[PDB]
């Protein structure tokens, strides 16, 4: 169905421990496909999915140069940020950027993204219009003024409507065996008595891709959202993900509870129960 | 800055004693990015543990997967030890095969 | 494929 491509930058200063580190990772949906780390050998953009290995030397040279240039640019940006927030050169700080595009089933742009953070807080964001900016504070407003003056939004829009979607479409075709395959969750409910009076029912979802999933417990048909323990969806290490949802239920009432599972790989939402 | 890590310790596949598997420690939701993670077998650090490339979520918090091949048993205890600027001392989380 | 925006600085 719908797909995304996102690049994620992390630039981290470390006073007394050399120049700021710059890392880029690229994803299509929940699949890492390229990485760059300025602390490497030998820093280069490196493939992390088989389908990107098809790209020729020109691709890799260009992608590496972009990242090597960015390493320098973001060191400058970290120095500028100190000035914008009246901070000393003694402390460690982080700039992050995430940008990319979503496409629909027909491959057309659904929306574009470009957003930055400083020390884990929103800094500046390209608006959905791909023409204006939202600055989080008076520091980011200085950057906004610079970017408005240079018509940066217009350049980004050109990329997001063009190369972003064009390359993503190519990746989806080259990786169609995996990127265009949903793996539904394998599901089961486990039973763990806490006491004579109460038991834990845990609804498991394993081996699914992509990561998006909904697990919900109902008691007599009513969602138990406030009373459910939901763990963060977690990577298995084989591309797939795992998740569980747990409720504490009175002993002898287990059959009043039903777990409901929604995932792209399922033809319809699934309902399951404790099966002793 | 600053957000303490969430920690989950778990296996790639359901644990069966004597069957080879992968032990995972997923650390997430943290900021800043520097973090120390060891996998422990009976209290001792497992050597040559690998990890994923630094990534982050929509809320800017970082996540990493640390992992190593292992063959679980009834006797052997596994854990993940994590240190971060937000933690006074390293936090140890024991592997529970039901979690 | 990445974008490179020349001269874009904070």
| Dihedral (CA of A192, A225, A29, A115) sign | negative
Resolution, angstroms, 1 dp: 1.6
Method: X-ray
Q: Cα A269 vs. chain centroid, distance in angstroms?
A: 24
**Rg of chain B (C-alpha set):** 14
Long-range contact pairs involving A220-229 (C-beta distance under 8 Å, separation at least 24): A220/A256, A221/A258, A224/A257
Q: Is A238 near chain B, with CB under 8 Å? A: yes
Q: Cα A147 vs. chain centroid, distance in angstroms?
A: 26
Answer whether B53's CB lies under 8 Å from A32's CB: yes
At a CB cut-off of 8 Å and minimum separation 6, what does A248 contact? Answer: A194, A198, A199, A200, A227
* Chain A residues whose C-beta sits inside 8 Å of any chain C C-beta: 7, 24, 26, 59, 63, 66-67, 69-70, 73, 76-77, 80-81, 84, 95, 99, 143, 146-147, 150, 152, 155-156, 159, 163-164, 166-167
Please tell me the distance from the alpha carbon of residue B59 to that of residue A68, in angstroms, as a whole number: 26
At a CB cut-off of 8 Å and minimum separation 6, what does A89 contact? Answer: A15, A82
Long-range contact pairs involving A227-236 (C-beta distance under 8 Å, separation at least 24): A231/B8, A232/B6, A232/B8, A232/B26, A232/B28, A232/B29, A234/B8, A234/B10, A234/B24, A234/B26, A234/B28, A235/B24, A235/B26, A235/B52, A235/B65, A236/A206, A236/A207, A236/B12, A236/B13, A236/B24
Place of tokens 């409720």: A247
Domain ranges in chain A are: 1-181, 182-272
Count of CA atoms in the C-beta half-sphere (13 A) of A212? 10
Please tell me the distance from the alpha carbon of residue A37 to that of residue A212, in angstroms, as a whole number: 28
Place of tokens 């630039």: A11
Write out the two tokens for A10.
Answer: 């992390």
Domain B1-99 has CATH 3.40.640.10: no
Which of these, A63, A262, A235, A180, lies nearest to B57 by C-alpha position?
Answer: A235
Backbone φ and ψ for A213, nearest 5 degrees, come out as -160, 155
Please tell me the distance from the alpha carbon of residue A113 to that of residue A104, in angstroms, as a whole number: 15
Q: Is A32 near chain B, with CB under 8 Å? A: yes
Answer whether B5's CB lies under 8 Å from B29's CB: yes
Count of Cβ atoms closer than 10 Å to residue A191 Cβ: 13
Please tell me the distance from the alpha carbon of residue A169 to that of residue A121, in angstroms, as a whole number: 32
**In chain A, where does DSSP find H-type helix?**
57-84, 138-149, 152-161, 163-174
A113 CA: distance to closest CA in chain B (Å): 11
Which of these, B39, B98, B83, lies nearest to A188 by C-alpha position?
Answer: B98
Q: Provide the 3-class DSSP secondary structure of residue A119.
A: coil
Could you tell me which CATH number the domain at A182-272 has? 2.60.40.10
Beta strands at A241-250 and A270-272: parallel, antiparallel or unpaired: unpaired
Answer whether B13's CB lies under 8 Å from B97's CB: no
Which of A35, A234, A238 is the closest to B53 by Cβ?
A35
Please tell me the distance from the alpha carbon of residue B3 to that of residue B60, in angstroms, as a whole number: 10
Count of Cβ atoms closer than 10 Å to residue A58 Cβ: 8
Ramachandran region, residue A143 (left: φ > 0; alpha: ψ -120 to 50; beta: rest): alpha
Please tell me the distance from the alpha carbon of residue A37 to that of residue A21, in angstroms, as a whole number: 8
With touching defined as 3 or more inter-chain CB pairs under 8 Å, the answer for chains C and B is no
Answer whether A263's CB lies under 8 Å from A184's CB: yes
Q: Is B21 near chain A, with CB under 8 Å? A: no
Count of CA atoms in the C-beta half-sphere (13 A) of A274? 23
Q: Please report which helix (H) or strand (E) contains residue A46, including its range.
A: strand A46-47
Angle at alpha carbon of residue A235, lines to A233 and A240, rounded to 5°: 100
With touching defined as 3 or more inter-chain CB pairs under 8 Å, the answer for chains A and B is yes
Answer whether B27's CB lies under 8 Å from B35's CB: yes
Write out the two tokens for B31.
Answer: 């900021």
Q: What is the DSSP letter of B68?
A: E
Given an 8 Å threshold on Cβ–Cβ distance, is B98 in contact with A242?
no
Answer whether A169's CB lies under 8 Å from A103's CB: yes
Write out the two tokens for A175.
Answer: 């990786």
Please tell me the distance from the alpha carbon of residue A207 to that of residue B69, in angstroms, as a whole number: 18
Q: What is the largest CA-CA distance in chain C?
A: 23
Could you tell me which CATH number the domain at A1-181 has? 3.30.500.10
Torsion of CA A232, A21, A46, B51, to 10 degrees: -40
Backbone φ and ψ for A44, nearest 5 degrees, come out as -150, 155
Answer whether A118's CB lies under 8 Å from A77's CB: no
Cis peptide bond upstream of B2, omega within 30: yes
Q: What is the DSSP letter of A157?
A: H
């Amino acid at each position: 169905g719908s797909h995304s491509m996102r690049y994620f930058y992390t630039a981290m200063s470390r006073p007394g421990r050399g120049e700021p580190r710059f890392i880029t990772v690229g994803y299509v949906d929940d699949t890492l496909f390229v990485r760059f780390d300025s602390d490497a050998t030998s820093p280069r953009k490196e493939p992390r999915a088989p389908w990107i290995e098809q790209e020729g030397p020109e691709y890799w040279d260009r992608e590496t140069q972009i990242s090597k240039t960015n390493t320098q640019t973001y060191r400058e940006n970290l120095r500028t940020a100190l000035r914008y927030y009246n901070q000393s050169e003694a402390g460690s700080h982080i700039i992050q950027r995430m940008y990319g595009c979503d496409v629909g089933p027909d491959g057309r742009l659904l929306r574009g993204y470009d957003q930055d953070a400083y020390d884990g807080k929103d800094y500046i964001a390209l608006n959905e219009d791909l023409s204006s900016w939202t600055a989080a504070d008076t520091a980011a407003q200085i950057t906004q003024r610079k970017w408005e003056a240079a018509r940066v939004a217009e350049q980004l829009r050109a990329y997001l409507e063009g190369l972003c979607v064009e390359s993503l479409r190519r990746y989806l075709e080259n990786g169609k065996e995996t990127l265009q395959r949903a793996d539904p969750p394998k599901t089961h409910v486990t039973h763990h008595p806490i006491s004579d009076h109460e038991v834990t029912l845990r609804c498991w979802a394993l081996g699914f891709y992509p990561a998006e999933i909904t697990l919900t417990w109902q008691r007599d048909g009513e969602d138990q959202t406030q009373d459910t323990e939901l763990v963060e969806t977690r990577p298995a290490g084989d591309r797939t993900f795992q998740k569980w949802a747990a409720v504490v239920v009175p002993s002898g009432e287990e059959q009043r509870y039903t777990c409901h599972v929604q995932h792209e790989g399922l033809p319809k939402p699934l309902t399951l129960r404790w099966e002793p | 800055i600053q957000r303490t890590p969430k920690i989950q310790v778990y296996s790639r596949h359901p644990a069966e004693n004597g069957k080879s598997n992968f032990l995972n420690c997923y650390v997430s939701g943290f900021h800043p990015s520097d973090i120390e993670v060891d996998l422990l077998k009976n209290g001792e650090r497992i050597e040559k543990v690998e990890h994923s490339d630094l990534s982050f979520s929509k809320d800017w918090s970082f996540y990493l997967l640390y992992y190593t091949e292992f063959t679980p048993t009834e006797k052997d205890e596994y854990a993940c030890r994590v240190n971060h600027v937000t933690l006074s001392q390293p936090k140890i989380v024991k592997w529970d095969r039901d979690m | 494929e990445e974008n490179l925006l020349d001269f874009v600085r904070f």
